């Protein structure tokens, strides 16, 4: 019927002065742009159709042509930045915002999706969507006593569009808009649908990837207990952003980090540090490393939860990126920790896997390991057991690798290596 037209026919139809011919041609266009194999977005743009579609968005008397043009423009705006830009240059943003209040749920949903595609282009179009006033009507669509009365696809689309309004940096979203959105976001974070939960956690992680003041406005809403709960979930699509958000939050101040510890997060890390997905392991170790960079009572919480043997484990056998994060965690631990704590680190077995890692080619990991070794020796000199440790390192082959490192391309590497040998092995 409207299946498989040419751009030529679609143009003649749009250029007739017959609303029903126009509707037929607009549906033909939509069906060309909804096929799988490489829709002809550029052909459609070149024929001059965007302005017409945009004008059809305002035809209140013909809701079907509103729907078909909204869908066609959604699919054009899902393409390259140049194609999204063509949609924005046609005046589409204010017209989609007007459509957000349509009494037809499928037209409203299509408007939501199109605005999400436009904001997903980047910071400039995100901020332009916000300036035209989208947040107010978007949030009004969700202002119901119980989210569970909304249709599932509708709620998932609204959530994804909100998440894109919270996304990207340079700049981050305006602070007034973040405060407008957060309450609804926390509500969606307590919903029971897994796709709503995953996209809400993603939005929260976007907002916590910033300076401590963004982190603070998120933590003041009390989402951390719910994030820890989600950190426990079985669906990887929920654990992944929940762990990202927790990690972001612990890049902040010691008191924000403490809010995470007090919600129970550490109890989850035995699973996370042994997770079969490499990315979970790496992200959990990066989080651990930012926790061992905290205060001594926080390091002691790490110890009490039994996580040092898990760090020894990831350092012994893991993807090399995870191992580099584990080295960072060890160095932050030996920098900030008490003597009892560093002794404990050594009694758990850190030295041998730490030494095995000095055979690696990455220069910064080697530098970090040497800093950690320094910190450990310097805990030993406070106890006079420095000879026992020197022996321990000699016995697993570490001192061989340090000597070899004396002659390294990096300056500080050779400097630290020679210092170590001439200061503890003579």
């Amino acid at each position: 019927g409207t299946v498989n037209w040419s751009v030529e026919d679609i143009v003649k139809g749009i250029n007739s002065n017959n609303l029903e011919s126009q509707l037929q041609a607009t549906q033909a266009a939509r069906k060309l742009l909804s096929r799988e194999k490489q829709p002809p977005i550029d052909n459609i743009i070149r024929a001059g159709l965007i302005p017409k579609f945009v004008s059809f968005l305002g035809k209140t008397d013909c809701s079907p042509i509103q729907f078909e043009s909204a869908w066609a423009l959604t699919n054009i705006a899902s393409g390259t930045s140049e194609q999204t830009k063509a949609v924005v240059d046609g005046g589409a943003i204010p017209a989609f915002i007007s459509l957000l209040a349509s009494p037809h749920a499928h037209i409203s949903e299509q408007a939501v999706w199109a605005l999400g595609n436009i904001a997903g282009d980047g910071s400039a179009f995100r901020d332009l969507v916000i300036k035209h006033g989208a947040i107010d009507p978007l949030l009004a669509l969700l202002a119901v006593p119980d989210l569970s009365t909304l249709a599932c696809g509708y709620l998932r689309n609204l959530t994804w569009t909100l998440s894109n309004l919270c996304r990207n940096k340079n700049p981050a979203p305006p602070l007034d808009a973040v405060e407008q959105i957060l309450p609804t976001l926390v509500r969606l974070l307590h919903h029971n649908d897994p796709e709503v939960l995953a996209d809400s956690c993603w939005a929260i992680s976007y907002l916590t990837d910033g300076p401590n003041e963004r982190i603070e406005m998120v933590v003041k809403k009390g989402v951390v207990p719910q994030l820890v709960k989600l950190l426990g979930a079985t669906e990887l699509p929920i654990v992944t952003p929940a762990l990202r958000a927790i990690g972001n939050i612990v890049t902040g101040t010691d008191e924000q980090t403490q809010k995470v510890i007090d919600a129970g997060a550490l109890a989850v890390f035995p699973s996370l540090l042994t997770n079969p997905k490499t990315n979970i392991q790496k992200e959990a170790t990066w989080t651990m490393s930012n926790i061992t960079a905290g205060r001594q009572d926080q390091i002691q919480q790490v110890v009490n939860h039994g996580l040092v043997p898990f760090l020894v484990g990831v350092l012994s056998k893991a993807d090399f990126k995870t191992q580099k994060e584990a080295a960072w965690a060890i160095t932050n631990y030996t920098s900030g920790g008490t003597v009892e704590q560093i002794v404990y680190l050594v009694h758990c077995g850190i030295i041998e896997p730490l030494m095995n890692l000095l055979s690696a080619k990455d220069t910064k990991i080697i530098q970090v390991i040497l800093d950690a070794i320094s910190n450990i020796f310097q805990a030993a000199e406070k106890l006079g057991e420095t000879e026992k440790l020197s022996i321990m390192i000699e016995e697993c082959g570490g001192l061989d690798k340090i000597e070899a490192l004396q002659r390294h391309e990096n300056e500080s590497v050779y400097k630290a290596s020679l210092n170590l040998i001439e200061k503890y092995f003579s």
């Binding site: 699919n75 899902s78 282009d121 998440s163 930012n290 160095t331």
Partner: peptide, 22 residues
């Protein structure tokens, strides 16, 4: 000298853009 280190490469994430197939 311990330091908190933000995420190496932040950008499994949701699609930035989505085609509507039906």
């Amino acid at each position: 000298p311990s330091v908190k280190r933000p995420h190496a490469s932040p950008d499994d994430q949701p699609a930035r853009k989505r085609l509507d197939f039906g």
